[PDB]
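Name: Proto-oncogene C-crk
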Amino acid sequence: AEYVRALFDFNGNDEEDLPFKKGDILRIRDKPEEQWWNAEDSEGKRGMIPVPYVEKYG
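Structure predicted for Proto-oncogene C-crk:
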């Protein structure tokens, strides 16, 4: 929980869903749900995204 990347892309719009790509990098800031995590895009936008549609980085 700190750095995750999407390998399925989705692009929501933000303000409710962090738009990612099929291999985008993000950071885990909050986690209200279990399936959706509040990660921040490289832009610094706090939005929820699917954990199954993304992974973690090292």
